[PDB]
């Protein structure tokens, strides 16, 4: 019952019922003119001050949440790419917040990097607050996908022609590499944004995941999490499960 565990539990419980959007940031494998662009082909470290700061935050989050009782053999390249994606995902969120003139402190958000059995690396984002309403979900997804596609093409480490960069940019938009949770529906039928409950989804779902400690990553595992209160960031896997237990 450390202060960190109690503090995270209390913070989540206070936000148990806060409605938020659910996004997933992802990428898909692309081959352009024989050039393979895989999930981890975006390893340029861009020298923009804010991005650099965000990437340092991800590194330190990884370092502090590492359990050293047990060994960890995650590939260095994998860690590097996840740290870079953490900074890029957050840059996208903050750019859209700027568009809406939303003070970052008025926003609740939670980010968790995972490895899916089929899709591989992806990043869940929960985000909402007083300046957010359900009808704005589709606009948010579109805007996020604009910035996500833009940053991915900038961060890509594969030597690309201008025509190839534009093709990659349009692939990332057309194929919706940022998804928005909606209610289930028919293909022809309208889709409605499905808001989720912030604290409940974090305590009862995201914090129940198993930590990735190997390459290849365990199917369904998580790499790294963070939130707007820096509450879950540094928690080790065992501590995260303790938070879930206390939350109930
Ligand atoms: Co997932």
UniProtKB/Swiss-Prot annotation:
RCR-3, short sequence motif: residues: 205-209
Motif RCR-2 extends across 122-124
Region of interest called DNA-binding, as start-end residue ranges on this chain: 1-248
- Domain PV NS1-Nuc, by residue range, is 16-248
* Compartments (UniProt record): Host nucleus
Q: Where is this region: Ori-binding?
A: 186-190
Briefly state the protein's biological role.
Multifunctional protein which displays endonuclease and helicase activities required for initiating and directing viral DNA replication. Also plays a role in viral packaging and transactivation of several promoters. Binds site-specifically to 2-3 approximate tandem copies of the tetranucleotide 5'TGGT3' within the origins of replication (Ori), unwinds this hairpin region and nicks one DNA strand thereby initiating the rolling circle replication (RCR). Cooperatively binds Ori with host PIF and probably other host factors, which activate the nickase function of NS1.
Query: Partners and quaternary state?
Result: Homooligomer; when bound to DNA. Interacts with human SYNCRIP. Interacts with host transcription factor SP1; this interaction allows high levels of viral P38 promoter transactivation by NS1.
Would you identify the family this protein belongs to, as annotated? Belongs to the parvoviruses initiator protein NS1 family.
- The identity of this protein, by name, is Initiator protein NS1
The source organism is: Murine minute virus (strain MVM prototype) (MVM)
Its lineage opens with: Viruses, Monodnaviria, Shotokuvirae, Cossaviricota, Quintoviricetes
Q: Which span of the entire protein is present here?
A: 6 to 253 of 672
């Amino acid at each position: 019952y450390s202060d960190e565990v109690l503090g995270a539990t209390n913070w989540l419980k206070e936000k148990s019922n806060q409605e938020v959007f659910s996004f997933v940031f992802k990428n898909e494998n692309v081959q352009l003119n024989g050039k393979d662009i895989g999930w981890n082909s975006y390893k340029k470290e861009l020298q923009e001050d804010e991005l650099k700061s965000l990437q340092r935050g991800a590194e330190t989050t990884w370092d502090q949440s590492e359990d050293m009782e047990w060994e960890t053999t995650v590939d260095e390249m994998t860690k590097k790419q996840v740290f870079i994606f953490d900074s890029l995902v957050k840059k996208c969120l903050f750019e859209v917040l700027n568009t809406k003139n939303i003070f970052p402190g008025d926003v609740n958000w939670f980010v968790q990097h995972e490895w899916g059995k089929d899709q591989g690396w992806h990043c869940h984002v929960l985000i909402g607050g007083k300046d957010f309403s359900q009808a704005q979900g589709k606009w948010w997804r579109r805007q996020l996908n604009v910035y996500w596609s833009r940053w991915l093409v900038t961060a890509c480490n594969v030597q690309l022609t201008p025509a190839e960069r534009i093709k990659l940019r349009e692939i990332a938009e057309d194929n919706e590499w940022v998804t928005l949770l909606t209610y289930k529906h028919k293909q022809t039928k309208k889709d409605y944004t499905k808001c989720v409950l912030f604290g409940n989804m974090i305590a009862y779902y995201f914090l129940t995941k198993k930590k990735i400690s190997t390459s290849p990553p365990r199917d369904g595992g998580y790499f790294l999490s963070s939130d707007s209160g820096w509450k879950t960031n540094f928690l080790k896997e065992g501590e995260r499960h303790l938070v879930s237990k206390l939350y109930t």
